[PDB]
Design a protein around this nucleic acid. Structure first.
Ligand SMILES: [Mg+2]
Ligand SMILES: [Zn+2]
Ligand SMILES: [Zn+2]
Lengths: 293, 99, 96, 1138, 227, 142
RNA sequence: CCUCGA
DNA sequence: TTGTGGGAGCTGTCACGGATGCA
DNA sequence: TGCATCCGTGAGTCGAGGGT
């Protein structure tokens, strides 16, 4: 039954088993295996280039031996070496010693580019780095309402940069769009009055890691604040498992109508008051409030 | 995996660098100071300036366009360059072209 | 511009014929770029002839540097005058 | 009380009650002892010969192992002798300024002998530039200061353990013969009854194959192992029997795919373990096994390799371990106990310090050079060769350079403040080459082992992943020449505690019984009560009487490290917050003015001077001259010494290292007195924070969940202001399109944007700069095709005719600002060492004055951390009856739950020392004050005091002082005998209805400051492979919306927010641009395209010969490439065309 | 293991040196144990997310009458300890009527706190509730079988991705699991033959228990007289 | 499972897991643990393939098994309990399996079997950048 | 990767 | 392209499932 | 052909700066 799985798979699909043996090895585009100059006149290459380079050296030496009619033992040596170098290029370390670079490190092969939380799947497809986002230290700020957060001025200005730019040009503060950009970058005073305008009623998502459950990301209405710290309503602490002993948090600016609507409706701080695990409220008074009441 | 600090360091001495989406958005939008200076010029001056100065067509080939001899095209080119230098005088100072 | 409505994503095994139908040219040399001029050696791992031009609308020997010449293949150097974007999507191959 | 063993030291009156008979050693001796050994310095020379006269240094040892170097025919011989050092090439500040390595040239005496012609050719040969260690116990390596950390490794020896069970429930026993250098040798028992020798990871050959390989015939092997029936079954089940046939089997099993040969198996087998060239037990490894089995008890340590008698004794020990016999005697042996060995016990876990690590790399380089020497002896024509021709020093230089350049043990010096750098040099790291690796870091190597007592501090260790892997040396601990840690104890003879200090390692300690420093003693020196708690061997607690007590701790804090010993009332803090306190002390940032604590220990002073960031008088004299720039001391000798001050230097971590004189012209200074303060020192003592007036109470929820409330006084009076200096470096270099130019002539820039640069294009000294300001104008040659249509029109119109460039100038990064305090430029036109291709290299130094802000991080010494929630006006702060507002409000809810009640005790004592006290001595001396030193019955305001850990101010003594608190100027007692006070709400004016504890608490400024941590990004750079935003605030990166975050979005069911995050805010290279385009024009946000990382994925699969195709709904594969022509109808046409 | 000697001292009194040194053992053992346990819990959460991610609410009601019976309650009723996690928030399968019948809660109600109170007060000690186990929906689950959305308190909306919420709700407190605990949760979710397998009766009958020495011999004679 | 039937296994597992979380004072509602357990009991091992194309012993989705049986009459399947990791690596989405873990193996087998990913699931629409099929992304709402 | 932060 | 010539670390991890190899 | 051994899998999230 084990062997039949393979055989029947090869006959039920019209592809032949010949594909399991390569006469030709493809080469990934060079931008996907970059090479960059570094301070010091030295270069940094992806491991893929060293692997392809060993494949090339061994194939060329094999061609040289075959032309020179070398002894069969030496040509067999070169053939085994070419095979092993293609083994490295495809999946290094799977058979025998891994091909190493300086400092004895195994060259990450085309297989490694896909495995683990480092590989393309878990590092670049199931999660990414995103624009319109920032991060800073959180402080308490008990003056807030549940749906609100203190967003620093210097954060809001960068996060909304194109919005404030379009507004700075709407009103005559900037005569064109390049001046709008330079104005936001020089932090000319006119931006600030405009800032409070664009950020009005424009929700933001706040996230604290580790995101253990969906309440680890919650939308708030931003209140422009004095200082360089995010102000976090004292009742959402439980949901984030946030204390104020140095914790930091991340800010994400939803752009499209649909994203803003999902933020105001699905993820609004005050619309997520109950633990989605137990159904009971999480946003209750905690410790200080308790001793108060 | 070459690092971000490494991509960035390299970009510091490169001819293009790691360009932002915004940078490329603005390059695809009009340069308002430039667009209006060009629209000021007469149509034929603007065309003879556009082809030669932006699209780098050789003078006989830009004569092949517009269906006008080489002399007409070069008169239009030099005089439109002059006029557009009449305008754009603050833009050249705003940018580094006054040096 | 892909409208992003795909029905299916299928894998098979690549035939050497497929591997060759993908390839834009065989890499033959182990050299990457010259230390003097920092330019990609011909038939190497970064060859512009088979992979694409390092600089937009430019050819290796410099005969064609213009968007005017667009889509023409330089006869002296064999590099296509197109966008350098291609160097992220153009595979080579190796005949063993 | 006086602590006057340090001259000029402040008078910190101490609550201690026990006498410290031994002083804390030089806290850098762990590193200076090691590197002076390697060099063979006269300091080491005197001491090593002053102890019991075989004085070989580290380099000398490497040289005698290598020499003589004979040729294959035994003809010629090269020999090395006499390591000598030239002066240093450059001073430390010069190496720091020029990105060089502080080093001194190394010479040796190379004598070549030619036995054929009899001639002898001596010479003095230059081995290389030898990196040198500073007066502070560090290294300058390419212009950055560094520390080589001591590494915990398992000592060479023979170690037996009991692995509980294989698949079955059978108890197995193993042993590894681990040498200092060579091949490994192992023996074990199986689920079945065989005794095998695994060697160099090869298969399990029965140990009888090795017995007959050595020469032990079957009858001779049967005789010794007769009592062990496990060996008999191993020989009854053996394959063959015979000397040479067991030798050749060793060869076939050693070399896979190799024809065996008897004569070639005989040589390489004696070459594996018995030949001194390839295999060498350390002197320690020899000492460990000769004490383990009891073979050579007459100290003949001259020969240290694997010997047959030791091998047979280990086999017999291994096999007798199954019987479990407590005793054993080997032929010629002595009653050794049979037990398993503990790999974590500090008698089996040595550490390799800096000298030994460098020796092991030198040995490698030397061996490479030697294999080059032997090959030169033939290619070269004899009688014409010289010692200069045989020796090639490139491998040795490369070995040294590689070590300091790549070793996990050569570390970027942690210098936030003197304490960070001081402990860093006292660290004991577990990871590294020849150590254990992180995937092997079990939970048990990380536990506090009972042998650590007095050697490795049990409190100071990292909270995160490196927990139990990074520990710091204990106060009185010292490393012995074998690499073990000893700790001093007082010899107790017949119940009287003498002053004989005796240093014992963990081994020597388990043989005795150790009492405590806090133990009752009479006036004569005798034990008061018979039975009291001691440390029974293997780390247990018993109560034996004092007639059997051998040694006693020389002091409390003997177990504790430098940073730990600085926590007052440590013994009132649970180990978790105490650890948090040691670690945050090493993150305190220096403040503009430094201020020693009112409540301290005696450790601040003795740690500040040893840390080396203070200036200390080398010899007594008078101050001749004193500037803010230097200090001159005219010794009574007639000589002068001068000490230039570090003025506003940038530490490795960006804190201000600014020395400041504390002497005056004419002052009499003694040897070792402190002349000038350092970054976090005040009058010679470590000053990591400020004394702050604290109230312990909740305040309107602004100190909710550990947040801190500060008075605005600490902004206005700069009490938590700190200076931070950044170094901005850019270079000009050769490019595929030309060479770069540092120029003031930048494209697309107004003259006003360049107003603050000088004529070269570098920012002008003293300028005030902000985000986006040019610091060094630089241009990089771009091709013509990279001119934008506009940049190409103006260039043609005005005929610029200068080569087209890109503005690649160095700007001020987002969110920082300061004064340019220093410019440093290096040119290639001038003769200046630069990397290849680099023409001009300039650094701009920017300094910011950082006021304490919302979001900055503060903590006390007890692990009581918090960030600042609100800085209130001085009028809003709760204030005392005299109008004094408090400085800091710490929430009550945080204290009791965390077991760091030490902070409350400190607050009480802090108030006592601020107000001063006068104990009523009229009728006599009250009962609580009985044990108090006379110098503590009264104290003037703002007095300076010590609470030594485990010997501090007791609860009764502290509560007494709260009674005799001197009043303020109006005769008012503001803090009652409980430590609480009446405070007015400065917002309403109504008093707070209950007394609040107020007092003085030392609060440090930790180096986690908002200015460093705020970050935001709308749009920026992207990584070239994936096209996703770069990472890191430094690179203007984007936040990572990771896997668990996508689950969150999914769980909400926010489809569009999840798509938009994953396509147009990250990866859709065209949708990115279309989106910024849309927002700027006030339109709707467009529809997402395809993430570039999916394309990258498919390309990588094809690279694995996988034919991945995307299919249409019904049709064939979908074309994923795009068009070469796009938007020509609009973009070119939008500048006035049609 | 517990040291036979206790720390007699409180922290107000201040520990001695030996007491502090030996308190260190437990302190650091805890810190390292937590460093490990969090990774274990995280891997478990990732596997749970992946196994359940494709589970969504597809229809409002599959209309099935299958369900599970839940306990709610010597001479007096006593509340059941686990009402909060197995009975509350469920959807009633069958009407709850007491002796001297009275419709306390109708089929298909929220079983909220008022409903559970009224149930207990009227003497109902068991209820039949709809469950995800008994849901008849082809792929995923129906809303009526799932119950209320724990987040909203109203019945679950149709598009909800209840698998991710379930994996998150099970993972989030995993770090609280000490020593078995998390090993046993993994043993159950990975569907392995357990350590210390306690065999069950294969068929109904009478048992013969043969006493060896460290060996038990169980035999079962079927009631059907089978083998 | 083979004695008291699938409906009883699900009760058994929910209660044993819930018990482990109970001994540590942790409140997990049963519906979550049920949502998980349900996914373990969705397949059937095949004892004999009477007329079908199914291999003996291979695990087949119950809907797949039954709906393919019905259009072969015009088949010996016993319920199987699988763990979560194994239930996951055996999905109809090769992309989902490759992005989960053991990527080399999933990708090898998918290549040999010429598998075609329907791109049905949440994870798969995430990877290609399509609207997930939940919440506001299902068709009745979008 | 190292050291660190929650 | 000629007298002789064999590495540097490694291990101080662990539970689980199923092929692989041995006899 | 019947297992014992070996080998291949997996082992939390997000930050900062340093920079062979
Ligand atoms: Mg925290
Ligand atoms: Zn060309
Ligand atoms: Zn249902």
């Amino acid at each position: 039954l084990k062997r039949l799985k393979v055989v029947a798979a090869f006959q039920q699909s019209g592809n032949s088993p010949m594909g399991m043996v390569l006469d030709a090895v493809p080469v990934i585009p060079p931008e996907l295996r970059p090479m960059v100059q570094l301070d010091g006149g030295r270069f940094a290459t992806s491991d893929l280039n060293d692997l392809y380079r060993r494949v090339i050296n061994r194939n060329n030496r094999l061609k040289r031996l075959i032309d020179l009619g070398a002894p069969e033992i030496i040509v067999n040596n070169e053939k085994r070496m070419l095979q092993e170098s293609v083994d490295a290029l495809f999946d290094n370390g799977r058979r025998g010693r891994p091909v190493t670079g300086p400092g004895n490190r195994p060259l990450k092969s085309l297989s490694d580019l896909l495995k683990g939380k480092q590989g393309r799947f878990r590092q670049n497809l199931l999660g990414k780095r995103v624009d319109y986002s920032g991060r800073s230290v959180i402080v308490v700020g008990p003056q807030l309402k549940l749906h609100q957060c203190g967003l620093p001025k210097l954060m809001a200005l960068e996060l909304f940069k194109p919005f404030v730019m379009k507004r700075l040009v709407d009103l005559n503060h900037a005569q064109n769009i390049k001046s709008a950009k330079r104005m936001v970058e020089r932090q000319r005073p006119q931006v600030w009055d405009v800032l409070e305008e664009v950020i009005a009623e424009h929700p933001v998502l706040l996230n604290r890691a580790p995101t253990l459950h969906r309440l680890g990301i919650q939308a708030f209405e931003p209140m422009l604040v004095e200082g360089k710290a995010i102000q976090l309503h004292p009742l959402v602490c439980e949901a984030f498992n946030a204390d104020f002993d140095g914790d930091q948090m991340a800010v994400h600016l939803p752009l499209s109508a649909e994203a803003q609507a999902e933020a105001r409706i699905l993820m609004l701080s005050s619309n997520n008051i109950l633990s989605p695990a137990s159904g009971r409220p999480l946003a209750m008074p905690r410790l200080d409030m308790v001793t108060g009441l | 995996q070459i690092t971000d600090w490494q991509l960035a360091s390299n970009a510091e001495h490169s001819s293009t660098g790691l360009r932002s989406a915004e940078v490329e958005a603005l390059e695809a939008l009009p340069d308002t100071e430039i667009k209006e200076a060009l629209q000021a010029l007469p149509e034929e001056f603007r065309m003879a300036v556009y082809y030669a100065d932006v699209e780098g067509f050789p003078y006989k080939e830009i004569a092949e366009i517009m269906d006008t001899p080489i002399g007409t095209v070069m008169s239009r080119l030099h005089r439109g360059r002059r006029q557009l230098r009449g305008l754009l005088a603050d833009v050249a100072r705003d940018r580094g072209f006054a040096r | 511009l892909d409208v992003n409505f795909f029905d299916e994503l299928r894998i098979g095994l690549a035939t050497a014929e497929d591997i060759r139908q993908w390839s834009y040219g065989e890499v033959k040399k182990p050299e990457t770029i010259n230390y003097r001029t920092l330019k990609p050696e011909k038939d190497g791992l970064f060859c512009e002839k088979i992979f694409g031009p390092t600089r937009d609308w430019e050819c290796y020997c410099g005969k064609y540097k213009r968007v005017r010449f667009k889509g023409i293949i330089c006869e002296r150097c064999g590099v296509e005058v197109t966008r350098a974007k291609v160097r992220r999507e153009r595979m080579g191959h190796i005949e063993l | 009380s006086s602590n006057n063993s340090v001259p000029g030291a402040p008078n910190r009156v101490s609550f201690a009650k026990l006498r410290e008979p031994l002083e804390v050693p030089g806290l850098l001796d762990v590193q200076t002892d090691s590197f002076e050994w390697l060099i063979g310095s006269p300091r080491w020379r005197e001491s090593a010969a002053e102890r019991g006269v075989n004085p070989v240094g580290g380099l000398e040892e490497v040289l005698y192992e290598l020499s003589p170097i004979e040729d294959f025919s035994g003809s010629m011989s090269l020999s090395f002798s006499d390591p000598r050092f030239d002066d240093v090439k450059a001073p430390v500040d010069e190496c720091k300024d020029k990105d060089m390595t502080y080093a001194a040239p190394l010479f040796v005496t190379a004598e070549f002998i030619n036995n054929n012609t009899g001639e002898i050719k001596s010479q003095t040969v230059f081995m290389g530039d030898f990196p040198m260690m500073t007066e502070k116990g560090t290294f300058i390596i390419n212009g950055t200061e560094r520390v080589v950390v001591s590494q915990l490794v398992r000592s060479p020896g023979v170690y037996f353990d009991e692995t509980i069970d294989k698949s079955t429930d059978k108890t197995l026993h193993s042993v590894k013969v681990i040498p200092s250098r060579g091949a490994w040798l192992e023996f074990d028992v199986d689920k079945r009854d065989t005794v095998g020798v695994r060697i160099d990871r090869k298969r399990r050959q029965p140990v009888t194959v090795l017995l007959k390989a050595l020469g032990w015939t079957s009858e001779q092997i049967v005789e010794r192992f007769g009592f062990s029936e496990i060996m008999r079954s191993t020989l009854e089940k053996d394959n063959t029997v015979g000397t040479d046939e067991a030798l050749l089997d060793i060869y076939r099993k050693l070399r896979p795919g190799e024809p065996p040969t008897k004569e070639s198996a005989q040589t390489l087998l004696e070459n594996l373990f018995f030949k001194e060239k390839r295999y060498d037990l350390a002197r320690v490894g020899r000492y460990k096994v000769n004490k383990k089995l009891g073979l050579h008890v007459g100290e003949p340590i001259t020969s240290s390799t694997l010997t047959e008698e030791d091998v047979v004794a280990t086999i017999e020990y291994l096999v007798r371990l199954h019987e479990g016999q407590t005793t054993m005697t080997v032929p010629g042996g002595v009653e050794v106990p049979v037990e398993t060995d503990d790999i974590d016990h500090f008698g089996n876990r040595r550490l390799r310090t800096v000298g030994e690590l460098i020796q092991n790399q030198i040995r490698v380089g030397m061996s490479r050079m030697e294999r080059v020497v032997r090959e030169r002896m033939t290619t070269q024509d004899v009688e014409a060769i010289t010692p200069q021709t045989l020796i090639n020093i490139r491998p040795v230089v490369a070995a040294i350079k590689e070590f300091f350049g790549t070793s996990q043990l050569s570390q970027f010096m942690d210098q936030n403040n003197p304490l960070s750098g001081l402990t860093h040099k006292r660290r004991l790291s577990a990871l590294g080459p020849g150590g254990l690796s992180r995937e092997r870091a079990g939970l048990e190597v990380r536990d506090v082992h009972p042998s650590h007592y007095g050697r490795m501090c049990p409190i100071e260790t990292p909270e995160g992943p490196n927990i139990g892997l990074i520990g710091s040396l204990s106060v009185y601990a010292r490393v012995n020449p074998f690499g073990f840690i000893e700790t001093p104890y007082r010899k107790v003879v017949d119940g009287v505690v003498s002053d004989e200090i005796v240093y014992l390692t963990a081994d020597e300690e388990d043989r005795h019984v150790v009492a405590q420093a806090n133990s009752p003693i009479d006036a004569d020196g005798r034990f008061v009560e018979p039975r009291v708690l001691v440390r029974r061997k293997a780390g247990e607690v018993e109560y034996v009487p004092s007639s059997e007590v051998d040694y006693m701790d020389v002091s409390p804090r003997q177990m504790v490290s430098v940073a730990t010993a600085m926590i007052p009332f440590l013994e009132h803090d649970d180990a978790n917050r105490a650890l948090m306190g040691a670690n945050m002390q090493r993150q305190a940032v220096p403040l503009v003015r430094s201020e020693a604590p009112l409540v301290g220990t005696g450790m601040e002073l003795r740690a500040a001077i040893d840390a080396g960031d203070v200036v200390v008088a080398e010899e007594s004299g008078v101050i001749e001259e004193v500037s803010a720039d230097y200090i001159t001391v005219m010794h009574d000798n007639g000589t002068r010494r001068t000490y230039r001050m570090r003025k506003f230097a940038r530490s490795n971590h960006g804190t201000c290292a600014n020395q400041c004189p504390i002497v005056d012209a004419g002052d009499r200074v003694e040897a070792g007195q402190v002349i000038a303060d350092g970054p976090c020192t005040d009058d010679g003592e470590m000053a990591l924070g400020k004394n702050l007036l604290v109230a312990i109470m909740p305040w309107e929820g602004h100190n909710y969940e550990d947040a801190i409330i500060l008075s605005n006084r600490l902004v206005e009076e700069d009490v938590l202001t700190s200076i931070h200096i950044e170094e901005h470096e850019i270079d000009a270099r050769d490019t595929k399109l030309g060479a770069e130019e540092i120029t003031r002539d930048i494209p697309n820039i107004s003259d006003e944007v360049l107003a603050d640069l000088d004529e070269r294009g570098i920012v002008r000294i003293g300028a005030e700069v902000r985000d986006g300001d040019i610091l060094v104008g630089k241009v990089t040659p771009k091709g013509e095709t990279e001119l934008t249509p506009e940049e190409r029109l103006l260039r043609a119109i005005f005929g610029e005719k200068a080569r087209e460039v890109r503005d690649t100038s160095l700007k001020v990064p987002h969110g920082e600002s300061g004064k340019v305090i220093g410019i440093r430029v290096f040119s290639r036109e001038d003769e200046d060492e630069l990397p290849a291709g680099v023409n001009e290299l300039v650094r701009v130094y920017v300094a910011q004055k950082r006021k304490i802000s919302d979001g900055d991080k503060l903590a006390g010494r007890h692990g009581n951390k918090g960030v600042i929630g609100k800085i209130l006006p001085v009028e809003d702060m709760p204030f005392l009856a005299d109008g004094t507002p408090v400085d800091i409000i710490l929430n009550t809810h945080g204290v009791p739950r965390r077991m760091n009640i030490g902070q409350i005790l400190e607050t009480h004592l802090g108030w006592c020392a601020h107000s001063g006290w006068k104990v009523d001595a009229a009728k006599g001396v009250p009962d609580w004050a009985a044990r108090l030193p006379d110098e503590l019955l009264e104290a003037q305001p703002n007095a300076i005091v010590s609470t030594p850990v485990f010997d501090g101010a007791q609860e009764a003594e502290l509560q007494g002082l709260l009674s005799c608190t001197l009043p303020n100027r109006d005769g008012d007692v503001l803090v009652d005998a409980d430590g609480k006070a009446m405070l007015f709400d400065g917002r309403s004016g109504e008093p707070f209805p209950y007394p609040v504890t107020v007092g003085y608490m030392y609060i440090m400024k930790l180096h986690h400051l908002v200015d460093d941590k705020i970050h935001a990004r709308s749009t920026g750079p992207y990584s070239m492979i994936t096209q996703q935003p770069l990472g890191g605030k430094a690179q203007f990166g984007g936040q990572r919306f990771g896997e668990m975050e996508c689950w969150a979005m999914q769980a909400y069911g926010a489809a569009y927010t999840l798509q938009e995050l994953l396509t147009i805010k990250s990866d859709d290279t065209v949708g990115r641009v279309k989106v910024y385009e849309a927002i700027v024009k006030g339109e709707n946000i467009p529809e997402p395209g395809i993430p570039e990382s999916f394309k990258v994925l498919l390309k990588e699969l094809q690279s694995l010969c996988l034919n991945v195709e995307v299919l249409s709904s019904d049709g064939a594969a979908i074309e994923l490439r795009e068009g070469e022509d796009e938007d020509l109808e609009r973009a070119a046409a939008n500048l006035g065309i049609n | 293991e517990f040291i036979p000697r206790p720390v007699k001292s409180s922290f107000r009194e201040g520990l001695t040196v030996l007491e502090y040194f030996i308190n260190t053992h437990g302190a650091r053992k805890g810190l390292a144990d937590t460093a490990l346990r969090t990774a274990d819990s995280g891997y478990l959460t990732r596997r749970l997310v992946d196994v359940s991610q494709d589970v969504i609410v597809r229809e409002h009601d599959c209309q099935t009458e299958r369900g599970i019976v839940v306990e709610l309650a010597d001479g007096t009723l006593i509340r059941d300890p686990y009402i909060e996690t197995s009975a509350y928030a469920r959807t009633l399968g069958t009407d709850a009527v007491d002796e001297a019948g009275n419709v306390i809660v109708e089929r298909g109600q929220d079983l909220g706190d008022p409903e559970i109170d009224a149930l207990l007060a009227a003497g109902i000690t068991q209820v039949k509730v709809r469950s995800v186990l008994t849901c008849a929906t082809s792929t995923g689950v129906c809303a009526t079988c799932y119950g209320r959305s724990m987040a909203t308190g109203k019945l679950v909306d149709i598009g909800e991705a209840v698998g991710i919420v379930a994996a998150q709700s099970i993972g989030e407190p995993g770090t609280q699991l000490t020593m078995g605990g998390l090993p046993r949760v993994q043993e159950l979710f990975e569907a392995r033959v357990p350590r210390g397998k306690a065999p069950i009766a294969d068929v109904t009958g009478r048992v013969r228990l043969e006493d060896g020495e460290r060996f038990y011999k169980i035999t079962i004679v079927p009631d059907d007289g089978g083998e | 499972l083979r004695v008291q039937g699938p409906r009883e296994v699900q009760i058994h597992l929910v209660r044993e897991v819930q018990e482990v979380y109970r001994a540590q004072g942790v409140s997990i509602h049963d519906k979550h643990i049920e949502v998980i357990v349900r996914q373990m009991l969705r397949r059937v091992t095949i004892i004999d393939s009477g007329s079908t194309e199914f291999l003996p012993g291979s695990l087949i989705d119950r809907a797949e098994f039954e709906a393919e049986n019905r259009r072969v009459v015009a088949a010996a399947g016993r319920p199987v309990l699988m763990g979560i990791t194994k239930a996951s690596l055996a999905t109809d989405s090769w992309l989902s399996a490759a992005s989960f873990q053991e990527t080399t193996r999933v990708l090898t087998d998918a290549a040999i079997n010429c598998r075609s990913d329907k791109l049905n699931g949440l994870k798969e629409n995430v990877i290609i950048g399509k609207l997930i099929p939940a919440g506001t992304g299902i068709n009745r709402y979008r």
